[PDB]
């Protein structure tokens, strides 16, 4: 069996921990607490291959910028996340996450991931974003961004409805195997 290390990063509260737990445990956490550092393991099957995925959870807050790179050594694939309901977090993808990840993880494949897919047409969400002349990220913006930053690929998912959660981790696994 093949062992690959995945690290997940992105703005605070954009759903990294739910994404990881729903894939590994098929369960959806309810506690509202920010992650500092955690580890999970998920087993995955792609293209007839058997992979043990080490999932490294991190903090999205700038406050942990000095500590976060402790997670980066020997990474085989990156999940770089933003939230569909937050245009600000997409903005921070080329401005903050891409430079940090390309610097500590050069030559490591990056899967750009738009989280919380269930919210793109959710009514309370669009109401709130419209208050600030914003709207949910459109797939196009997400896909475009993945090209700007040179991601291995673009996936959207919703951890809560599990929509796409699976495909995220096969893309990531296939990225890692090469």
């Amino acid at each position: 069996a093949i062992r690959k290390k995945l690290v997940i990063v992105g703005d605070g509260a954009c759903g990294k921990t739910c994404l990881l737990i729903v894939n590994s445990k098929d369960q959806f956490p309810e506690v509202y607490v920010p992650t500092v550092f955690e580890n999970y393991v998920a087993d995955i099957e792609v293209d007839g291959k058997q992979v043990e995925l080490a999932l490294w959870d991190t903090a999205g807050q700038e406050d942990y910028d000095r500590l976060r790179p402790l997670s980066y050594p020997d990474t085989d694939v990156i999940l770089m996340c933003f939230s569909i309901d937050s245009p600000d977090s997409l903005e921070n993808i080329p401005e903050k996450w891409t430079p940090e990840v390309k610097h500590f993880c050069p030559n490591v494949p990056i899967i750009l991931v738009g989280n919380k897919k269930d919210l793109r047409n959710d009514e309370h969400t669009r109401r709130e974003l419209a208050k600030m002349k914003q709207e949910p990220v459109k797939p196009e913006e997400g896909r475009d961004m993945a090209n700007r930053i040179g991601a291995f690929g673009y996936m959207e998912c919703s951890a809560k409805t599990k929509d796409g959660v699976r495909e995220v981790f096969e893309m990531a696994t296939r990225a890692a195997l090469q």
Partner: protein, 192 residues
């Protein structure tokens, strides 16, 4: 500046705090979510130009919180001091609740009063945030996680992770102790 200078309470701090108290306490994930980097950067630049002439209503609330935490992290020496760092850590290493608490408050009277001024204002702020946990979802614990690296700094940074959890416990206990002492003071006011 304005920013990254030696620390009643600095007007930039107060201005930022008072606006968030007036406007932000119902925002889900206050201090947990970050602002847009560029909008945050512009707000920081503005508060170097004309600190009082800044209409904060023109900025997003997570940019405003972003700049607040950026201010704390850019202080020459952290709010809680370099000197007392080791003593806060040990206060936390004590075996049971009430003496950890008693030690932490014992460390606090050792602070230079300018640090003590800004720090107590900030802790009061965080109390107000947590009292409204039912709306904004921020527990004392969540706030401690976020603010602990802002308030105290060692450098390894290997087992700085082990240390970060302790300064988190320290700040979490301050928030909680101030919060219950709030509950009791409100009670005592109606008494005798």
């Amino acid at each position: 500046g304005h920013f990254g200078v030696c620390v009643s309470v600095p007007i930039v701090l107060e201005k930022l705090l008072e606006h968030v108290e007036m406007h932000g306490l119902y925002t889900e994930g206050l201090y947990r979510k970050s602002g847009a980097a560029n909008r945050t950067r512009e707000l920081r630049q503005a508060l170097q130009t004309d600190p009082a002439a800044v209409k904060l209503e023109n900025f997003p609330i997570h940019a405003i919180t972003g700049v607040l935490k950026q201010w704390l992290r850019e202080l020459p020496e952290p709010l809680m001091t370099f000197a007392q760092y080791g003593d806060f850590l040990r206060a936390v290493e004590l075996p049971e609740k009430q003496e950890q608490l008693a030690a932490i408050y014992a460390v606090l009277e050792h602070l230079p009063e300018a640090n003590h001024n800004s720090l107590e204002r900030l802790i009061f702020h965080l109390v107000k945030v947590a009292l409204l946990e039912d709306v904004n979802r921020m527990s004392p614990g969540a706030l401690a996680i976020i603010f602990a690296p802002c308030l105290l700094r060692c450098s390894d940074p290997l087992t700085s992770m082990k240390d970060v959890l302790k300064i988190t416990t320290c700040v979490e206990m301050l928030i909680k102790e101030q919060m219950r002492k709030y509950k009791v003071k409100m009670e005592e006011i109606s008494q005798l």
